[PDB]
Amino acid sequence: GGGGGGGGGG
Amino acid sequence: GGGGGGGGG
Amino acid sequence: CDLNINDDPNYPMNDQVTADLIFPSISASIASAVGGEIYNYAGFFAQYYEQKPESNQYNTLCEYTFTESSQQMDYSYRILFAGALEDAKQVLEKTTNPADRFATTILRAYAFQIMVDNTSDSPYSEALQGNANATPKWDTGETVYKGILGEIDAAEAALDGSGMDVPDLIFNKNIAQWKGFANALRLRMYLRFIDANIDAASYTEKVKTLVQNNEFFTGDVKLDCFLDETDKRNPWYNTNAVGLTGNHCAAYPLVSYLSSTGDPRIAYGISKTDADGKYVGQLPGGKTHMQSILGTDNWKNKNVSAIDYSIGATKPVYFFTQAELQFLIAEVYARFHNDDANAKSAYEAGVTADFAVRGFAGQENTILEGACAWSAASTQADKLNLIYMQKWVSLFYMDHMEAWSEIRRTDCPKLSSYSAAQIQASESVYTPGELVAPWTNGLEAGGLMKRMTYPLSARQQNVNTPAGVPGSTPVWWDIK
Amino acid sequence: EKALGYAATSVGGEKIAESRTSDVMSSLAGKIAGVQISSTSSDPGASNSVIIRGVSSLSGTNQPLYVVDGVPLNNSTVYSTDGLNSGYDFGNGANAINPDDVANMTILKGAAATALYGSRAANGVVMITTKSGRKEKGVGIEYNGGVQWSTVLRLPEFQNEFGMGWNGNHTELENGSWGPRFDGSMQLWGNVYNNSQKLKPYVAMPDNIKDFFDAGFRYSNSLSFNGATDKSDYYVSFSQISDDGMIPTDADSYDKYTFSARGSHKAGALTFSSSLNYAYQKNNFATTGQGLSMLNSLYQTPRDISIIGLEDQNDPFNTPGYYYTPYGVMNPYYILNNYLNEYESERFYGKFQLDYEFLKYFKFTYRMGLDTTTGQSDKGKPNLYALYYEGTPNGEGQGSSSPFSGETGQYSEQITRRREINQDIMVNFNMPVNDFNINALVGFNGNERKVSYQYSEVNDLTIPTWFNLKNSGKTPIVEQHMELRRLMGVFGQFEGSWKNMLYLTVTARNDWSSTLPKENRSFFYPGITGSFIFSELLLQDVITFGKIRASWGKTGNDADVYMVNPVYAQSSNRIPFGSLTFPLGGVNAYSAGNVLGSNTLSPEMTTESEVGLNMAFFKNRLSFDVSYYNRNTDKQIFSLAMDPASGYTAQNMNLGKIRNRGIELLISGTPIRTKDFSWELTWNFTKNWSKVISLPEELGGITTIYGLNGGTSMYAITGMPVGVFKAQVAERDPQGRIVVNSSTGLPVEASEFGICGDMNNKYQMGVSTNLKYKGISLGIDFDIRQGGVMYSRTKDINYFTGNAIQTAYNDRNPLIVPNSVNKIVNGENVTYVENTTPITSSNIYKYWGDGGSDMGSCFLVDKSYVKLRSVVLGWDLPKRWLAKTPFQAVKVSAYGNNLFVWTPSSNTFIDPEMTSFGNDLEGNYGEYTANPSSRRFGFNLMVKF
Amino acid sequence: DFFDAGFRYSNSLSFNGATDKSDYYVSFSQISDDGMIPTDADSYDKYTFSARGSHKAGALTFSSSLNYAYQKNNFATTGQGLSMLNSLYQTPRDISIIG
Ligand SMILES: *[C@H](CCOC(=O)CCCCCCCCC)OC(=O)CCCCCCCCC
Ligand SMILES: [Ca+2]
Ligand SMILES: [Ca+2]
Ligand SMILES: [Ca+2]
Ligand SMILES: [Mg+2]
Ligand SMILES: [Mg+2]
């Protein structure tokens, strides 16, 4: 499926 | 005011 | 109640959409992928950049721990086939202008060249059929190359002298430059067959005939139309500098090589470390290991050299750089003719062409008279290594999908024999420029990335999609 | 009526309204069998979901048809189309009705006799009936004045063992808590400003997130004016609501205003009545998402850092350039004080009805409805780059990894215009013969629904803070959109009756829809229902009521607008986290649309079978209702997923059957009843079986409903329930043991994603009690929903950030995953070996971020909960105290809603009544750091004049 | 001869009644005009709906008036450019305009 997301800083 | 234009002939 | 109101007013009438209106989409669709996420992961596989210590977007590309369900190229798969390849099919239905059909066929051909160079097989003879065939079979990569080369051939033979009447954001209606684009594509795919040892007799002679005619392109084959705006930027910059934060840092093979040769191009797209002011690359897949070994505050973003995104906002998308075209010629002379002086000439021409694009025009001599001087390449293998290692530098920050594929065809840069951990422990065993198998390597078989996974959308919706195979599986034209 | 032959429930306004919720529907959460009512979030003004007997529409219209008097009501929802980065919800069309105006609400659950309201009725019908006229004593003025607070209900349970850091090492700048075990020693933290830095004891601050919230406050004022004669009646009302919720500043805002005027006058056989209503709302929302949003920034806090110590902006260390952490987040008080996401809406709806009785047994009725709405969004965010990038750590000091790149400002505005028109012409015939009774109804329906909007956006703001389309030196982005659909139908409904014992009904309707292919607009759907009251003409007097029920029938349906003909869109390309759109560069371009049209479509047909039993005993002191239903929605037109290699990514075609079967059970009684005291108990039980039956084979048996790219995704798969989840699980050897990586210790991903449960509750139920002692009332309702799963980014971010108590698992010492093997692969030889590799301290942060041995599936969370839904304490004052006063009645009332939630052991993170993806099917995917749910409690004064 | 005959049909309905304590009026009006310039570019649609009521009860009288008004307009733009009439007048006296 579509949408994507980032990760975080660390 | 604001402008108008001539015609042609 | 007029019920005859189911014509979507948000779109034009289908008659008013002629082939001049559809055609400009094709070059842009392709460049969205090839200069975008495909360019992005290919940069990792070709070991140009690595994952920044302080962010986490691309851990699984660098450590080779993605899988088929990671959809690492579904966006591009959809753009190339349901964006570009469909628009192209519509163009060839709507116009009969052989010049337009020639540019359309070239761009269509290039699209299949990119998909095959990622997943070997590709839908082709049954693609773009709609409800007539929701589940097209995936042709073998040899059938696809052989077919689209014949398409280019038959579309060129169709030219009648008339001109292009479609908006051309690539060459601006210059039919000579389009023929040069196709012969450079012929040259690229002929060398793939040759080093795949498949009808290598013909394609050796055909590549010989091709380089003799010198009917190639001038400048770079690119899409030069981007603005530092919004939805108008270079895809790789738009995604990786606006959509996300800075994730890319310089990788160790590229940095050690540009440092060894004294290359001033080491300043283009790479930035000195914010901590000591030198150039540092990160060993592929070794972000977490470097933090483990050195500690948290000693392997931060400041301790590694960051990929510069500032030259990126309006940077064009490249389909075939001139330096790479010269380097292929250089190869054809060096190992199919007996012409060391034409080889040296095309080699030097490529290095000169690239020094000029990256803004160091007039400095090429620092490698053409120093460490990468053709004079000091004794064997015909030390010459080929030199042509290939400079082809690799040349394609950094220009066309990463090709860099990955030329690494795979020619297997140069060589894969080092030492591990990431052995290189980190004692640098002297490492030959600068050689690839390093990732420190964390999700490939049960080890080694370097050989292909992309089949797109998950095809997997779920097309029963005739080949079964997933590990990243280590070579593409039909890589045989060592 | 209640000669009905299918499940229905009646509630009067007093129950609707006693809860003093702003909304007519949310009070009924868990109070009616087969009616799944849920709020999208605790944010003021947000939408309410209402699904009746499961999901039939695969995308994506499952709300019931709201019918008010009785004209269809617009129930359109306004929520963000990108829930991942800018999640917000601004309300749904039913939230506009003022509950104080409701006399009766009747929910028709079954879809076998829907000839009266048409296709939309297959999702069920919510028939509301508004109050009319008196005469009473004395002037006819009722005032309700309310006040209520909201506080935060459930935050994730945190670890308070380790503080700011990464890899288990100390840090001065992290957005997380993988540091050392708390010392009490004095360490540094935060950025450095003017050669100075903050220094604090390294201790835990367990209340830090809890202390960040305020108390929401809400004040309401409602008035009504009433009167009647023997030929006429007149009602006029006004309601006012102003909510500023628990998140600090005024970003949680909802102002509701309504005005209504309803009248009827009879002159002979003719009756003309009319209702006209205006609704206002102003929503402001604290935007959610994975970027620079408030809650995402808030969860990414070390356990030792004082959050409420960050609000003072005259403290340089809190200014955006010197904020203590530069990792993809910002000072939450900055985001709330400097971002914008406002909505203002104006809405007019009403009806006109002309009744005329003629020739003893006939009655002509013309009824016409109009509902129109103008809504206007305004969102903006500052040019963070211009203001704070140069010269600060967070900053130029971060380079390309600064949260200010490329945050150059943005401002958009959109004006939506909605409009629906409904017209009914009917003729009724009602005549008794020899104990029989005949009631015929012949009618015509005409429907017209229209929506349009105008969007316009500018980026890269010249003056950093000003939000205006003039404030940019770059190209503006404009978009325009409009849809229009029409429907006409003719219908008939035959009611047969024998001696108030045997009731029979036959319904038939043919529709002509604009959204079906021109050669196939017409669809016909009949129905039949029966009711047999064996109470009457069965002695005792033990059985108050005994009625048996049965129904079989069909409801047809059309498709969404513009699904038949192919279109060409303005060329654009969707790339990860961006777009490339035409024009380029000076050229405009068109592209072939990715959704294949179809002119072979046929209509949708829902068929339902239902049988039911209703009995009362001991003069209604014991009463139960049981329904058994079998629902099949067939040929639903849907944009079905397709291989992009075909040239399109979807094809519109008629789907297979989506089946909903189950049981609806209600039991109530009054175990104690004296003159001054009564005690009632109510128990209702729903169990629904959901199953997609087939999805067209030719395109696969699977299709996405919502889902992240390479992440957890919710599907509709052929032989499985609606809303199947797939997510990454770890690899196992043939003998059950977990495969891990020889060198890192971390789990190894399996080849394919694993199925991980569905969206559906396995059962739902509620239990109520109601005490009345003289003037005092008490009501206590419990909502109980068990089973299913939902994606939770709140668990995601708290695992990743090292803040959830689970991540303190092994005292964070190096550990070998229990039962771990290594997969020894040589070419084609597979061998497994006991794993010797520990996960090092430095890598434990990543073990939990990925979701431990569970990997991605770890973040599918159990949907189950028991909830103290509402408690209402009412005191009706004795009529004697009001005599030398102007007052006819006075009732003080204390109440509380969403008061306490109980979840299984495994969910210590969210109130499962949460989404970021709207109030229908796609919302069931999960919550994407939706704002915390709240606990609400207040007072209400009622004053009759 | 270039001009047509504009056409307009109108429909107005009112509903009325009262008692000694109450009065109630409801009305609807529709107008559709297509003027004398040829084609439908000179058009006006007008719809109104109104409900007016009052109720007396004791010293207290409450009353309300609510109205909805719709219009759609199409204008044959005028002016010194490529407008209909400016084109119409700059016609030689020997040219058949209906041709
Ligand atoms: C949209 C739906 C399409 O259906 C119709 O055309 C309605 C026709 C029936 C008119 C009934 C008149 C009853 C007379 C007592 O409908 C519309 O867009 C509205 C068009 C105009 C209707 C005006 C209604 C006047 C009522 C006083
Ligand atoms: Ca607030
Ligand atoms: Ca412990
Ligand atoms: Ca006219
Ligand atoms: Mg397309
Ligand atoms: Mg190879």
Give the CATH number of the domain where residue C424 resides.
1.25.40.390
> What is the CB neighbour count within 10 angstroms for residue B4?
7
* Distance in Å, alpha carbon of C55 to nearest chain A alpha carbon: 4
Select from D444, D250, D263, D278 the least CA-distant residue to D342: D250
Q: Which residues, including other chains, have CB under 8 Å from residue C89's CB and lie 6 or more apart? A: C128, D647
Q: Token match 């394919």: residue? A: D752
Select from C344, C346, C353, C345 the least CA-distant residue to C327: C346
Select from D644, D794, D819, D661 the least CA-distant residue to D740: D819
Q: For residue C62, is it left (φ>0), alpha (ψ between -120 and 50) or beta?
A: alpha
Strands (E), D558-593: 568-570, 572-575, 578-581, 590-592
User: Three-state DSSP class for C206?
Assistant: helix
Contact D275, D252 (CB under 8 A): no
Type and span of the H or E element at C101: helix C98-119
How far is it, in rounded angstroms, from Cα D683 to Cα D767?
Answer: 5
**Interval between CA D592 and ligand 5 midpoint (Å):** 4
How far is it, in rounded angstroms, from Cα D546 to Cα D536?
Answer: 8
Evaluate: CB of E49 within 6 angstroms of ligand 1.
Answer: no
Give me the phi and psi of D692, to 5 degrees please. Answer: -55, 130
How far is it, in rounded angstroms, from Cα C444 to Cα D433?
Answer: 85
Contact D581, D570 (CB under 8 A): yes
Q: Which DSSP symbol is given to C243? A: I
How far is it, in rounded angstroms, from Cα C182 to Cα C175?
Answer: 11
The CA distances from residue D896 to D19, D95, D870, in Å, are 8, 20, 6
Which residue intervals of C120-174 are DSSP H helices?
141-156
User: Three-state DSSP class for D741?
Assistant: coil
Evaluate: CB of D423 within 6 angstroms of ligand 1.
Answer: yes
Give me the phi and psi of C391, to 5 degrees please. Answer: -55, -40
Half-sphere exposure in the Cβ direction for C344 (13 Å, CA): 12
Q: What is the resolution of this structure in A?
A: 2.8
Neighbours of chain C (3+ CB pairs under 8 A): A, D
Strand partners, C175: none
Select from D783, D759, D785 the least CA-distant residue to D915: D759
Q: What angle do CA D707, D911, D908 make, to 5 degrees?
A: 95
**How many C/D residue pairs have CB atoms within 8 Å?**
314
How far is it, in rounded angstroms, from Cα D677 to Cα D894?
Answer: 20
Q: What angle do CA D407, D410, D416 make, to 5 degrees?
A: 150
Type and span of the H or E element at D897: strand D889-902
User: Three-state DSSP class for E16?
Assistant: strand
User: Three-state DSSP class for C63?
Assistant: coil
CB contact under 8 A, D589 and C52: no
Which tokens hold the place of A9? 């800083």
The distance from CA D443 to its chain's CA centroid, rounded to whole angstroms, is 35
Sign of torsion over alpha carbons C156, C161, C163, C166: negative
Q: Which DSSP symbol is given to C81? A: I
Select from D121, D8, D1 the least CA-distant residue to D66: D121
Contact D114, D528 (CB under 8 A): no
- Distance spanning both ends of chain B, measured CA to CA: 26
**Interval between CA D648 and ligand 5 midpoint (Å):** 6
Give me the phi and psi of C49, to 5 degrees please. Answer: -135, 170
Type and span of the H or E element at C115: helix C98-119
**Interval between CA C303 and ligand 1 midpoint (Å):** 74
Strands (E), D111-152: 125-130, 141-152
Which tokens hold the place of D194? 């003017």
CB proximity E80 to B under 8 Å:
yes
How far is it, in rounded angstroms, from Cα D402 to Cα C306?
Answer: 13
How far is it, in rounded angstroms, from Cα D52 to Cα D75?
Answer: 15
The CA distances from residue C381 to D16, D314, D833, in Å, are 86, 67, 43
Give residue D818's identity as a one-letter amino acid code.
P
Give residue C32's identity as a one-letter amino acid code.
S
Range of the domain at C454: 1-480
Q: What is the C-alpha R_g of chain B?
A: 9
D244 known ligand binder:
yes
The CA distances from residue D69 to D270, D271, D273, D367, D499, in Å, are 18, 15, 11, 10, 30
Reply yes or no: is the peptide bond before residue D138 cis, omega within 30 of 0: yes
How far is it, in rounded angstroms, from Cα C188 to Cα C441?
Answer: 30
How far is it, in rounded angstroms, from Cα D405 to Cα D386?
Answer: 10
Type and span of the H or E element at C335: helix C322-335
Neighbours of chain E (3+ CB pairs under 8 A): B, D
Which tokens hold the place of D477? 């982005």
Q: Token match 């003017």: residue? A: D194
Q: In what order do the strands lie in the sheet with D595-596?
A: D595-596, D650-654, D637-641
Determine what percent of chain B falls in helix, strand and coil, rounding each to the nearest 5: 0, 0, 100
Sign of torsion over alpha carbons C437, C442, C445, C448: negative
**Cβ-Cβ contacts under 8 Å, E17 against chain D:** 231-232, 265-267, 272
Q: Which residues, including other chains, have CB under 8 Å from residue B6's CB and lie 6 or more apart? A: none
> What is the CB neighbour count within 10 angstroms for residue C480?
9
Pairing relationship of beta strands D77-79 and D65-67 according to DSSP bridges: unpaired
Which tokens hold the place of D541? 């007097």
How far is it, in rounded angstroms, from Cα D256 to Cα D284?
Answer: 12
**Interval between CA D38 and ligand 2 midpoint (Å):** 22
How far is it, in rounded angstroms, from Cα C413 to Cα C406?
Answer: 9
Evaluate: CB of E13 within 6 angstroms of ligand 1.
Answer: yes
How far is it, in rounded angstroms, from Cα D615 to Cα D127?
Answer: 24
- Cβ-based burial of D790 (10 A; exposed 0-12, middle 13-18, buried ≥19): buried
Q: What angle do CA D22, D25, D31 make, to 5 degrees?
A: 125
Strand partners, D259: D238, D278
How far is it, in rounded angstroms, from Cα E37 to Cα E87?
Answer: 13
How far is it, in rounded angstroms, from Cα D155 to Cα D209?
Answer: 8
Contact C10, D495 (CB under 8 A): no
Q: For residue D872, is it left (φ>0), alpha (ψ between -120 and 50) or beta?
A: beta
Give residue C405's identity as a one-letter amino acid code.
S
The CA dihedral of C31, C34, C39, C42, to the nearest 10 degrees, is -170
Contact E67, E50 (CB under 8 A): yes
* Distance in Å, alpha carbon of B5 to nearest chain E alpha carbon: 8
CB contact under 8 A, B5 and E90: no
Reply yes or no: is the peptide bond before residue D496 cis, omega within 30 of 0: no
**Cβ-Cβ contacts under 8 Å, E64 against chain D:** 236, 261
Q: Which residues, including other chains, have CB under 8 Å from residue D73's CB and lie 6 or more apart? A: D66, D67, D93, D94, D97, D128, D349, D371
Q: What angle do CA D731, D735, D741 make, to 5 degrees?
A: 35
How far is it, in rounded angstroms, from Cα C250 to Cα C234?
Answer: 20
Give me the phi and psi of C81, to 5 degrees please. Answer: -100, -45
* Distance in Å, alpha carbon of D882 to nearest chain E alpha carbon: 19
Give residue C424's identity as a one-letter amino acid code.
Q
Strand partners, D262: D235, D275
Pairing relationship of beta strands E43-57 and E22-34 according to DSSP bridges: antiparallel
Evaluate: CB of C1 within 6 angstroms of ligand 1.
Answer: yes
b/e burial code for range D486-517 (CB count within 10 A of at least 16 → b): bbbbbbbbbbbbeeebbbbbbbbbbbbbbbbb
Pairing relationship of beta strands D125-130 and D102-108 according to DSSP bridges: antiparallel
Q: Which residues, including other chains, have CB under 8 Å from residue D673's CB and lie 6 or more apart? A: D621, D679
Contact D106, D69 (CB under 8 A): no
Angle between helices C340-357 and C322-335 (to 10 degrees): 170
Contact C24, C167 (CB under 8 A): yes
How far is it, in rounded angstroms, from Cα C277 to Cα D339?
Answer: 38
Which tokens hold the place of E10? 């109108």
Give me the phi and psi of C174, to 5 degrees please. Answer: -85, 95
CB contact under 8 A, C57 and A7: yes
Contact D693, D661 (CB under 8 A): no
D471 known ligand binder:
no
D378 known ligand binder:
no
Q: What angle do CA C71, C76, C77 make, to 5 degrees?
A: 75
Q: Which residues, including other chains, have CB under 8 Å from residue D394's CB and lie 6 or more apart? A: D191, D320, D321, D322, D323, D326, D388, D402, D403, D404
Chain D interface mutation, best of E62, E65, E67, E70, highest count of D Cβ atoms under 10 Å: E62
As separate numbers, helices (DSSP H) first and strands (DSSP E) second, chain C gives 20, 6
Select from D635, D636, D485, D454 the least CA-distant residue to D562: D485
- Cβ-based burial of D14 (10 A; exposed 0-12, middle 13-18, buried ≥19): exposed
Q: Which residues, including other chains, have CB under 8 Å from residue D447's CB and lie 6 or more apart? A: D72, D118, D420, D421, D422, D423, D486, D487, D488
Angle between helices C175-194 and C98-119 (to 10 degrees): 30
How far is it, in rounded angstroms, from Cα D493 to Cα D721?
Answer: 35
**Cβ-Cβ contacts under 8 Å, E80 against chain B:** 4-5
The CA distances from residue E70 to D36, D193, D650, E33, E46, in Å, are 39, 62, 40, 14, 6
CB proximity D82 to A under 8 Å:
yes
Q: For residue C141, is it left (φ>0), alpha (ψ between -120 and 50) or beta?
A: alpha
How far is it, in rounded angstroms, from Cα D367 to Cα D354?
Answer: 6
Q: What angle do CA C441, D746, D801 make, to 5 degrees?
A: 115
Pocket test for ligand 1, best of D351, D353, D423 (most atoms within 8 A of CB): D423
Q: How many domains would you assign to chain C?
A: 1
Q: CA nearest D458 in C: which residue?
A: C230
How far is it, in rounded angstroms, from Cα D475 to Cα D140?
Answer: 59
The CA distances from residue D696 to C159, C186, D566, in Å, are 44, 42, 21
Reply yes or no: is the peptide bond before residue D60 cis, omega within 30 of 0: yes
Whose C-alpha lies nearest to ligand 1, atom 23? Answer: E30
CB contact under 8 A, D227 and E57: yes
C–D contact (≥3 CB pairs within 8 Å)?
Answer: yes
CB proximity C13 to D under 8 Å:
no
Whose C-alpha lies nearest to ligand 1, atom 13? Answer: D366
Which tokens hold the place of C300? 């931060």
Contact C316, C223 (CB under 8 A): yes
How far is it, in rounded angstroms, from Cα D646 to Cα D641?
Answer: 11
The CA distances from residue D279 to D147, D349, D594, in Å, are 21, 8, 39
**Could you tell me how many residues make up chain A?**
10
Evaluate: CB of D370 within 6 angstroms of ligand 1.
Answer: no
Give me the phi and psi of B8, to 5 degrees please. Answer: -130, 150
The CA distances from residue D265 to C368, D151, D224, E53, in Å, are 100, 48, 19, 10
**Cβ-Cβ contacts under 8 Å, A10 against chain D:** 166, 174-176, 178, 327, 845
Select from D807, D840, D854 the least CA-distant residue to D176: D807
Q: What is the C-alpha R_g of chain C?
A: 23
How far is it, in rounded angstroms, from Cα D662 to Cα D182?
Answer: 53
Evaluate: CB of D440 within 6 angstroms of ligand 1.
Answer: no
Contact C283, C439 (CB under 8 A): yes
The CA distances from residue D704 to D59, D80, D576, D690, in Å, are 10, 19, 18, 17
Give residue C29's identity as a one-letter amino acid code.
S
Evaluate: CB of E28 within 6 angstroms of ligand 1.
Answer: yes
Give me the phi and psi of C456, to 5 degrees please. Answer: -60, -35
Using beta carbons and an 8 Å cutoff, which residues of C are at the interface with A?
54-57, 59, 244-245
**Cβ-Cβ contacts under 8 Å, C54 against chain A:** 9-10
* Shortest-distance ligand to the CA of residue E5: 4
Which tokens hold the place of C413? 């840069």
